[PDB]
């Protein structure tokens, strides 16, 4: 989407593979705020908003 029309998807009722994102490493910046960038984001989450 364009910046102004930011598109929001709700990630609900599914298990997540956070480590594929981390080990891909093709992501230029993978900066994490409030949650660990050291593979500790694998926690139970009520709401994941993308």
């Amino acid at each position: 989407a364009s910046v102004y029309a930011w598109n929001r998807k709700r990630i609900s009722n599914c298990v997540a593979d956070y480590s594929v994102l981390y080990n891909s490493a093709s992501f230029s910046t993978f900066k994490c705020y409030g949650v660990s960038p050291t593979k500790l984001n694998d926690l139970c989450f009520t709401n994941v908003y993308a």
Partner: protein, 48 residues
């Protein structure tokens, strides 16, 4: 999150919101993630 809390009660009194205490048990929580700024009540009718 859009949260709806519900409670059902019998009533025997005419008008003007009879007194009493009743905690509202939660009913549903819709993970919609949308913006709500206005709401219109919906009422059915009868035809004969």
């Amino acid at each position: 999150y859009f949260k709806i809390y519900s409670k059902h009660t019998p009533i025997n009194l005419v008008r003007d919101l009879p007194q009493g205490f009743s905690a509202l048990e939660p009913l549903v929580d819709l993970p919609i993630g949308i913006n709500i700024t206005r709401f219109q009540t919906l009422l059915a009718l009868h035809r004969s």
